[PDB]
Paper text:
ExbB and ExbD are cytoplasmic membrane proteins that associate with TonB to convey the energy of the proton-motive force to outer membrane receptors in Gram-negative bacteria for iron uptake. ExbBSm has a long periplasmic extension absent in other bacteria such as E. coli (Ec). We purified ExbBSm alone and ExbBDSm and determined their structures by single-particle cryo-EM at 3.1 and 3.96 Å resolution, respectively.
Due to this strong bias in particle orientation, the resolution achieved was 3.96 Å, precluding reliable positioning of the side chains. In the refined model, Asp 25 from ExbDSm monomer chain G faces Thr 218 from ExbBSm chain C, while Asp 25 from the ExbDSm chain F faces the interface between two ExbBSm monomers A and E. As compared to the structure of ExbBSm, there is a slight «opening» towards the periplasmic side (the distance of Ala 197 from one subunit to Leu 204 of the facing subunit varying from 25.5 Å in ExbBSm to 29.8 Å in ExbBDSm, much greater than any error expected due to the difference in resolution of the two structures). This opening of the structure is limited to the periplasmic part. In summary, we show that ExbBD from S. marcescens has a 5:2 stoichiometry with a larger channel allowing solvent or proton transport from the periplasmic side as compared with the E. coli structure.
Residue numbers in the entry:
A (entry chain F): 18 to 40
B (entry chain E), D (entry chain D), E (entry chain C), F (entry chain B): 46 to 281
C (entry chain A): 52 to 281
G (entry chain G): 16 to 40
The structure:
């Protein structure tokens, strides 16, 4: 029904993890 | 500090807006649930008692007499008075089927109005249950944009500075979700109870219309049969 | 990259902003018109609730504003009786009248829901074009970070930034889209119920007056004359 | 740490509470599954048996007798008694067409009532299957924001520090979806079964109405052609 | 050992379990597609020839004479013998309107049952296409839980110890998705085809009901007119 | 590879397959859009012209006279022709209500068939836009599994080679999405416009039906009543 | 009729995981 909202949270998780990757 | 409740202290230009929006949504859905539930439970108990009282009707006059002492806001007596004033307006009209069709359409419009009255906040319940996660995501992506412009305008590899913004974003998200799930579950249970109530009112409407038809057809059969078959073939 | 990566981004962005302003102006116009029509039908229903025959209803409706489905249907039933024109099939007359009334009110309710599907599709497709923007931006960012292999990712920021900006535009166009769509569904359901009520009222009036006129004229003319002359 | 069965402490108290909620929801949905499935298979066998019995039903008394010898707690016997008592009440009347109309109205009303009484828990399963992914993602975002605020109050640089809360979110999502899937499966299954049951009860109700029309036409046409035309049309 | 021919070797309990489940789903939907669609298209050719032959049927007895040698399972034969036995049952009755009404009722019940039996698997296809992404997500969450368990119990920053695990997890996701795709596309195309078939059988049912009503009117009109007119208008 | 279009004729077999599939879906949706739009524009123009031409109907013969000048590709023409031949077949009888109701039912079936064949590509574009993201997702997950087994072969912890593979994967995703969105929006547009067109056909069907009823009533009532009155009450 | 709501989450999750593992620290 509305199981769509995973997109933005998962992508921002990706972004924050990839930017914390250096330090 | 940054608990689920500790947001109005650390709110922002969009954070405060989404926070007040979601707390307003939660409050309004809670009060709608409580008020509509109490009202409909009491109304359904009253309607069950009234249907139990009228479940032994024999004629139109007897049904009206036994229902005179009902509540003022009695949908049953409403339908009885509707049928009675319909018969009054149909006085001196020897068209049974026409009266039956008129009464049927009248009970249909009555139950439609009753469903509209009961199903009055359910639309808003569905709206809020659909939009609360979406406005949560809106606040989340706005917080993401704020964090991104802060990173681009202040480039530092600090691991601790990136935490609070995303934390508040996901907290607003969770507030949206905890406003959404109660909204939809109450919408569903209200749909179930309004289906039951509309089935009950359709049952009592069927009861009153079938009683009307029965008594009218019996009277018509008797009188028409006797008079016509005893007078107008020897009177020719 | 190739200098044709943000052109589609700004294109879909202005598309969402124009869709949102169209939703806003259609909200304004449709709300004004529907509230005006609701007040008009409420006043005219309150005026016509005191009707007994078709003559009084017609003489009162002729004084109303002719921009009302009520008087349209009233004069339509009058013209249908005039077209019946000395035909003693009252039952078929009533059936054709009710069918015409139903077709007319269905057509009017259909004309009422103009932007329903419009806002529906707008709110449905805005998140998808947001996802398209995001995936294309992150693809170009990956192409750039592959052309310049490094662990520092200070260059991905504008790409994902404009991507999530387009996404947020899709959301701020879809949320009002869907809520106004639902509000419109509710108000057109109310208006449809109201016009159905007034159609049932006028049909009941027609049937009642027809039966009133036919009752005595049938129980006094055909009965005695022929059942004594047969 | 050994498995999911041994990670019930390192999460939030509300996370464990909603997890136990999901487990009990799955348990009660499976219980409703077993109970409603047994009841529906019993009703299906009863319907098929009653249909095989009425396969040659061509007389109201015969139908009532052949149905009463079976389990009288059957909707078939209910409908038969309903039609019989309605004819008894509206007897000695000449509203044959209105007789059929009112009878069919009462039959379809009782059929709708019984069908509603059959499909009750389907709505509950629908709500459970709809809210379980939502509450799963709610627990997910709650766990992830708890992890983020814990990393904020602390200072962690390693990559293995985000493991516990994220894993708790994963198991919450898993519980939510293993509650969701069978919910919608049984929802659609029971939808199909109640559709078939409604088809069968409509078939038997149309059979009762057909037999009623048959016997009434047999009693009316012969008596009219033998008596009604000879009663007074000769003395005119 | 990475592809489908070797992933089952190092497959876990739930990996091989969901893999067997999804491949069984794929093969069962393929077999249902083949068998059901072949049966439906063959019955479509049959009913096409049927309505082609019935296009020149302008009577009742001629329709029966043409149906005498139809296919061993011709639905048109079913409807025609239904109308015939219904006339036999409600014979010797001059209230043909109720006969037509009961005929229409029995015919609509029969065509509803036939449409239910023809599309007896469309609901199964819908359920499969709906739940296949959900069991896919179950695979996702279980695999990610296992990978997080492996990376948490082994608090190391290594990457080659978890790459095959997440690889098999996403492989389970991919196989669930490639099982979902054919299910849903076949369900949609089969729903379109069965809707066309149901429309066609509705056309042939309307044709046979039109023929029944027309022949009944033609047989009753002139005879009743002359007989009743003469007798009960000259003897009055 | 490093070029967006560089790696299209190599290193992508299933990816090229799904890309060709989605581009074929897009172009077939576009040509169906063009053709069906031209067809519906022509149909609605012709229907509006014929409605404004026949709005002054008084009887079926005048309707046929004003309609003979229509284009041979006129659905309203074939509807009124079906009505006329049905009246011709039902002639030599007196089942006024029966004739009008059987023509009404045949007209309902005919307009249902016309709407289902006119609005044919609706489900086409629906399933096309539904499966396009499915096959795009299958392509991207297959590319992901290929990259993962490649890293499993040569253990690469870098990010350089990781970029173009996932880039082509998301390219497949975006292509599926930009094939789906136009499909679904034009499907919605076609659904709305064919709903409006079938509503217009319903209006013209109601027009011809009320015309039939009115002409039958006017041609029957006065003539029959006065002639039979005179005849059988001077000869009875 | 709809299109889908599930399939995107698969690639979102797998990209999230490949990125968090490819993260050096």
């Amino acid at each position: 029904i509305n199981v769509t909202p995973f997109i933005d949270v998962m992508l921002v998780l990706l972004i924050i993890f990839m930017v914390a990757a250096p330090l | 500090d940054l608990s689920i409740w500790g947001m109005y202290q650390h709110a922002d230009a969009v954070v405060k807006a989404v926070m007040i929006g979601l707390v307003l949504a939660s409050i309004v859905t809670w009060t709608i649930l409580f008020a509509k539930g109490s009202e409909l439970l009491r109304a359904k108990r009253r309607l069950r008692r009234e249907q139990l009282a009228l479940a032994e009707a024999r004629s139109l006059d007897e049904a009206s007499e036994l229902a005179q002492n009902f509540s003022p806001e009695s949908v049953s007596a409403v339908l009885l008075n509707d049928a009675q004033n319909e018969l009054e307006l149909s006085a001196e009209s020897n068209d049974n089927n026409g009266i039956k069709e008129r009464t049927g359409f009248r009970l249909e419009r009555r139950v439609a109005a009753y469903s509209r009255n009961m199903g009055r906040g359910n639309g808003f319940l569905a709206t809020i249950g659909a939009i609360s996660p979406f406005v949560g995501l809106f606040g989340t992506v706005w917080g993401i944009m704020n964090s991104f412009i802060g990173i681009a305008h202040s480039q530092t590899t600090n691991l601790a500075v990136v935490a609070p913004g995303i934390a508040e974003a996901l907290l607003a998200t969770a507030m949206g979700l905890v406003a959404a799930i109660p909204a939809v579950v109450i919408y569903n249970i209200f749909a179930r109870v309004i289906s039951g109530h509309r089935a009950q009112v359709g049952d009592v409407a069927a009861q009153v219309l079938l009683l009307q038809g029965r008594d009218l057809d019996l009277a018509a059969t008797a009188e028409a049969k006797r008079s016509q078959h005893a007078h107008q073939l020897r009177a020719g």
